Amino acid sequence: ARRQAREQRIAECMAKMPQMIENWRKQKRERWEKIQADKERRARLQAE
Amino acid sequence: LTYCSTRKGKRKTVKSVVHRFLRLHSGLWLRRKAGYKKKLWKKSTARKKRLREFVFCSKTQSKLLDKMTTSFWKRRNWYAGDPYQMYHDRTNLRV
Amino acid sequence: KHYGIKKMEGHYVHAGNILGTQRQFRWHPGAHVGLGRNKCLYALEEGIVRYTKDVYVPNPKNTEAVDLVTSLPKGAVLYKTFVHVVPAKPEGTFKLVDML
Amino acid sequence: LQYLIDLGRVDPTQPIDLTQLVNGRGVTIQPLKRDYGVQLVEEGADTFQ
Amino acid sequence: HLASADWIEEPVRQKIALTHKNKINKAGELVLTSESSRYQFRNLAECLQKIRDMIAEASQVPKEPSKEDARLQRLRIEKMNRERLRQK
Amino acid sequence: KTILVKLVSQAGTGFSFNHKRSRLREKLSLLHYDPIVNKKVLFVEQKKIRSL
Amino acid sequence: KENEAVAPEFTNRNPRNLELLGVARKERGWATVWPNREFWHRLRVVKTQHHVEAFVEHLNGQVVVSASTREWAIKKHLYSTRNVVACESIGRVLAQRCLEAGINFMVYQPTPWEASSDSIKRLQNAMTESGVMLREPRRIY
Amino acid sequence: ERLEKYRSFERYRRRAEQEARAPHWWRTYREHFRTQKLLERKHFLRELRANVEEERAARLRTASIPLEAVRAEWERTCGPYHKQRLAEYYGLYRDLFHGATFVPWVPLHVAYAVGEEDLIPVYHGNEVTPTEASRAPEVTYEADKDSLWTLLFINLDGHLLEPDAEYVHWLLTNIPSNRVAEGQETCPYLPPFPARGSGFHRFAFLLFKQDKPINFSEDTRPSPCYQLAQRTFRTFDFYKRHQEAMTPAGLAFFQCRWDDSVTHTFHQLLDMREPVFEFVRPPPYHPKQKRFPHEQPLRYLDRYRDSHEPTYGIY
RNA sequence: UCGGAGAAAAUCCUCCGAAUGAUUAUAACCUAGACUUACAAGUCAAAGUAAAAAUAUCUUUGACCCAGAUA
Ligand SMILES: [Mg+2]
Ligand SMILES: [Mg+2]
Ligand SMILES: [Mg+2]
């Protein structure tokens, strides 16, 4: 019972693992986008 | 240590040795690495691997551990399914 | 510490032996000689160690090395010391396993 | 085991138990030293007849 | 002798001969050996299992080709070059 | 300062490893190798272990 | 039978025997220098003022297959010694010789600008189409 | 300061590589490890330059070249020299003539016919499977009238008993001019038989110019001959006996592996058990054992053990 | 106590820092051969396997016992 309970637990979390990794990449990218976007502002260009 | 005990008149084992080292019948002694369980969060991965290993002892250390234990700990033990079954003997040792 | 040359030129060196330890690039990796993180030099093959000088060309990507290289006078190029181990044995031999 | 049988120290006609092995001195048992008996070991299997 | 042997069914015999041609002697007998133990019991046991595995794998069709290993990749690429070289 | 935090695998396994985080920053989340699953999965902060 | 006699140790003398099998040594050092020397064969493309040359050279330093725009046969069928198509055409000529010589796997080490250069990109396309692999396989240990 | 400075990376690289080639006092890695044709040539070029269509294609980067025309022209001009490089690179001149080098001059052509639709060519360094080489190949080498020839085909590294010796496959003698059927078949054609697991064997075609017809009675072999003891043959000493009338002029060689057809050859006609070889690497180096392997892991004992199975001695 | 630098392998010889953080592409397991070393501790690493489809990048220290926190 312990082995089966452990195995199904891993499977359920693993099933949702793809989507969760996808979400964490979106947050990381948009975090970078804000840095690069606000870094490349026309106001920043105005100073440049 | 005690060379001649009051009750039996015998040598006495230093139990702190028996609690830290393994004797293979060939005469070798095994031990762990000091600090292998300490502050692992700041140790490098290669350093941690080195710490996890079982390591042999030198000739002088082996001589000291032999003095600090009695003959009972130097005997042959025939344990079923022993994981050190193969390491109680030396092979192709010319010296 | 005890930095220096562990293996000198003309010595038989096995696959993993360390040849030299250096705080700075006193010697450079050559042929069949690898680099450690600490910049130590170890053999990658069984052979005889050789120290030889040769021209230095850096990776294009790194800016500083290219700029220094380009700024060199047109006449000549800079040099460096390289360490080499000459493999002393063949990779393997073919033997008769079975006759059918 | 073959060596003991060949030299007559173990009688193959009757059943063999730990008593027979001990009586013929084929094996030495120390119960006080945690012996629980004898295990058959494959060594010599090729030449056992 | 693979072909003469009747205990193996004929359809299996043909597949085994093609698949394991390298292990068939000039006399036509299928020669397999084991040298992985000091006791001939296990060496014989290892040899027998090869016979059983060979029969079973021939009986069951290997539909899956699996991934192409680098050795297969090198073999395939050099074969293509030979074809292109022989454009004559 | 900096605190040592315990990142826990979100693949359902009990696997976790300790990392260091600057207390001013938000809770850390990383992609890391889970030996019990043999795949790279998200590790999410669960507890603070000590202050570095 | 006299025929059955076979020497215990075979001695194949073909220079490319181990290299073709994949067990031959590739130099793995030169970590501080560019380009790496872990190649059985290398493609060297030199663009001079006049002409453009492509070579295949072994580690020992002996050129095996050479295709150059300074060669009479190629010159008569081309319009200019240096050109983007030239690179393409010489690459195709080089490949056929490379296939002819049996050198199917090779190492090319372009510079960042050279790799981005359109002429070199087209030349690599010709070699890939010809069947010459620009990346060598890993050694067998 | 007087000298200019390299303004680009490439200039230094070209200078460096040329610098490396030159020998130097210090130790280095390398040590241890006619007129009418010119005028006609120029005239054709000018015509090509004049052609507007050539310009338009080039500027449109759509131009192309005919490979076959270049190959034939390359053969006439410098094909002999490039072929020499391959022969030296492949070791033919050192294994065949004990270091003597001859430039090939006759554009020898050989191809193995597969059925009748197409025929596999045999260039320098080509790869041909033994199945493809089952039957003798067509040979056309443009002799011209007269000038008798001898064609010799041998596997340089296929010998199974003596390393230096090699096995003849077929030898044609007194070949008059182009026609090759008119040659005496001293050695019948044999299919290649490279042993399994023995690597790549290099087989070469050798063509010798014959000043005067010479009977090679010593080199005649019974047809068919299936004895390897009789196929053993040295090119070097053979050329010594006939060097007066034999001078090499043609080359063509290919690499072949073992194949299922090789199994047929070893059994059907050679009538012997086929040899099987495997590549063996030397045993790994381990330092001499110490009775006390101080500061070594438990694995130290496994390095020097031979059998992985328990032993019991007197027990 | 340890690290960096001069004298240059001596000194009560002369200086700077550390009991670090930052940075992140998160950096596995297993295993030849070596360095350093009284012991203890500390370094580098081919091959193989496994994740991915570039390593972490900057450049250090505290043993044993004994107490904790968890699955
Ligand atoms: Mg006993
Ligand atoms: Mg120590
Ligand atoms: Mg590796």
Swiss-Prot record, chain B:
- Record's subcellular location: Mitochondrion
Query: What family is reported?
Result: Belongs to the bacterial ribosomal protein bL35 family.
User: Which keywords does the record carry?
Assistant: Mitochondrion, Ribonucleoprotein, Ribosomal protein, Transit peptide
Q: Name the source's superkingdom.
A: Eukaryota
Primary localization? mitochondrion
Query: What is the protein name for this chain?
Result: Large ribosomal subunit protein bL35m
Any one of the GO CC terms: mitochondrial inner membrane
| Name of encoding gene | Mrpl35
GO biological process terms, alphabetically, are:
mitochondrial translation
> What is an example of a GO molecular function annotated in this UniProt entry?
structural constituent of ribosome
- What organism does the UniProt record list as the source? Mus musculus
Lineage of the organism: Eukaryota, Metazoa, Chordata, Craniata, Vertebrata
Swiss-Prot record, chain C:
Instruction: Give the GO biological process terms.
Output: mitochondrial translation; translation
One example of the protein's molecular function in GO is: structural constituent of ribosome
Q: Where in the cell is it found?
A: Mitochondrion
A single cellular component GO annotation: mitochondrial large ribosomal subunit
Q: What is its main location?
A: mitochondrion
Q: Which domain of life is it from?
A: Eukaryota
Q: Keywords in UniProt for this one?
A: Mitochondrion, Ribonucleoprotein, Ribosomal protein, Transit peptide
| Subunit comment | Component of the mitochondrial ribosome large subunit (39S) which comprises a 16S rRNA and about 50 distinct proteins.
Report the sequence similarity comment from the record: Belongs to the bacterial ribosomal protein bL27 family.
- What is this protein's name? Large ribosomal subunit protein bL27m
The organism named in the record is Mus musculus
Q: Which gene encodes it?
A: Mrpl27
Query: What stretch of the parent protein is included here?
Result: 49 to 148 of 148
UniProtKB/Swiss-Prot annotation, chain E:
Q: How is it modified after translation?
A: Methylation of glutamine in the GGQ triplet by HEMK1.
- Compartments (UniProt record): Mitochondrion
User: What function is annotated for this protein?
Assistant: Essential peptidyl-tRNA hydrolase component of the mitochondrial large ribosomal subunit. Acts as a codon-independent translation release factor that has lost all stop codon specificity and directs the termination of translation in mitochondrion, possibly in case of abortive elongation. May be involved in the hydrolysis of peptidyl-tRNAs that have been prematurely terminated and thus in the recycling of stalled mitochondrial ribosomes.
Membership in a protein family = Belongs to the prokaryotic/mitochondrial release factor family. Mitochondrion-specific ribosomal protein mL62 subfamily.
Q: Tell me how this protein assembles.
A: Component of the mitochondrial ribosome large subunit (39S) which comprises a 16S rRNA and about 50 distinct proteins.
What's the name of the protein? Large ribosomal subunit protein mL62
Of the intact sequence, the residues represented are 104 to 191 of 206
Swiss-Prot record, chain H:
The record, for CDD domains, names: PEBP_euk
Question: Which GO BP terms apply?
Answer: mitochondrial translation
Q: Which UniProt keywords apply?
A: Coiled coil, Mitochondrion, Ribonucleoprotein, Ribosomal protein, Transit peptide
Pfam families, per database record: PBP
Specify whether Aminoacyl-tRNA synthetase is a keyword of the entry. no
Give the source's domain of life in one word: Eukaryota
Quote the InterPro entries the UniProt record gives.
Answer: PEBP (IPR008914), PEBP-like_sf (IPR036610), PEBP_euk (IPR035810)
Coiled-coil stretches noted in the UniProt entry, renumbered to this chain:
35-58
Query: What are its GO cellular component terms?
Result: cytosol; mitochondrial inner membrane; mitochondrial large ribosomal subunit; mitochondrial ribosome; mitochondrion
According to the UniProt entry, where is the signal peptide? none
Q: Identify the SUPFAM superfamilies for this entry.
A: PEBP-like
Name its cellular compartments: Mitochondrion
Q: How does it assemble?
A: Component of the mitochondrial ribosome large subunit (39S) which comprises a 16S rRNA and about 50 distinct proteins.
Similarity remark = Belongs to the phosphatidylethanolamine-binding protein family. Mitochondrion-specific ribosomal protein mL38 subfamily.
Instruction: Give the protein name, as stated in the record.
Output: Large ribosomal subunit protein mL38
Q: What is the name of the gene encoding this protein? A: Mrpl38
